Amino acid sequence: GLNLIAAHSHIRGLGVDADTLEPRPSSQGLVGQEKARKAAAVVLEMIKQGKIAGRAVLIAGPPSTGKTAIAMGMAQSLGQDVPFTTLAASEIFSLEMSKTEALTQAFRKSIGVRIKEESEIMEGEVVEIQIDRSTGGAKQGKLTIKTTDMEAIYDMGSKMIDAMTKERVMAGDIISIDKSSGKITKLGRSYARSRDYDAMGVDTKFLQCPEGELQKRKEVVHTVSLHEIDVINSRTQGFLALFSGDTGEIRSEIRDQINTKVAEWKEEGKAEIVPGVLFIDEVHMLDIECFSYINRALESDLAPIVIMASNRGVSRIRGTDYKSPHGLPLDFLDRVVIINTHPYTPDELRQILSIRAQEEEVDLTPDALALLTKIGQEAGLRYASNLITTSQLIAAKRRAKQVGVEDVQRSFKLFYDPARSVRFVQESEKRLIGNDGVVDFSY
């Protein structure tokens, strides 16, 4: 389909026993990281429980230790029930809006308003449309519709006859009509009428007739974020800015009104509030102004849980000239609990490579998996994982059905790991342009 194979495609969940929060040694595509997966499952529990507002969790650990994987596992194990916003900290440096406004919109995106509504929908195969069009139009007309179980005829009001002519509704068309709006969606063409569709090309699909009653109440559970309500109220087609962007800085008094109205809908029981998650990937790309805003945004009642990942050690905080752990100011780190991801053992690398060799269509011979595991220890999990794809392409060039050691060796030879790449750089320092701008082009 349109989803290709990607680095996280094998993550199907968090891999944790829902009855106990005990992490299984591997399941759902996660291997090891058990203590970190247990902690993320405790966070996941209190996300679903909703009662706790504006807690922040940092996932801290060396690169490739599964920090994004655990974040993706939580997203896959929340699903559609809960809003889940992913933010790269690079994204808030907008030219359209100040970074605290961009960071406000991200918090607003992570609270859902859940609204349950009904409508009568009429659905069936058109047996006939008669419209007289009697000079003017839409004067009178009759609609006959059937399911497999019923047939009925309807006199149409003139603004429904406009809708029918607008949708060029024809005998044999399978339609749904939302009655209160009066919009007509043509779900398809009935197969029994196929010969009447003389203009439709042979690529055309056909359907069986709808089943049961022509009319029923269908109930829709909408979830709309606070950000969407904010943007809708900004201007006469405010929602249109939810797509193009081109929201300005939305005025604070609009948000304050909406917070009051959503509290009214909750107290009236018309709507429910569904707190989600905001995940801030590589949070150390934020600067000191951002962290000062976050500190108090977290104290709002309508704050999501915020989950964060950092590769950084004791490192320079952006927008200042001093250093702190994770690159995050201590006053912000006081508001945050930290989950640590550790490096992998060789057998866990073997399992992750095996999983990645299942997610791509690759057969690894047992010695090729052993060699990739050895390369994984020596050159890192990500590099060996990229040798899987490379080896399959080399094997296919030699038309082999399984990837052999010869293919992994060609991969290791053709594509350098980060350390050999650095060693190549440290040898070529006269040919590579230095930090001084100096370079020699002679042989």
């Binding site: 047996v127 006959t144 019923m150 009925a152 005829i153 309807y154 049961g212 009653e213 009319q215």
Partner: protein, 63 residues
């Protein structure tokens, strides 16, 4: 002087000719109004003379 009868201009509600429950549907074939698919099944299975009796109970006739 027997000129005391009065017509009505308001749109009338639709009731099932069999069960008298409200009727969303008018059957194009037999022209009985009916409540649901269960009653449509009966209506199409009726003895041939019976359909005209359900019409006639509300003063309607097919011809």
């Amino acid at each position: 002087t027997n000129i005391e009868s009065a017509p009505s201009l308001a749109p009338m509600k639709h009731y099932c000719d069999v069960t008298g429950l409200p009727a969303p549907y008018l059957d194009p074939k037999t022209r009985l109004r009916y409540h649901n698919k269960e009653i449509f099944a009966m209506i199409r299975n009726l003895p041939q003379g019976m359909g005209e009796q359900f019409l006639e109970a509300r003063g309607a006739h097919t011809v």
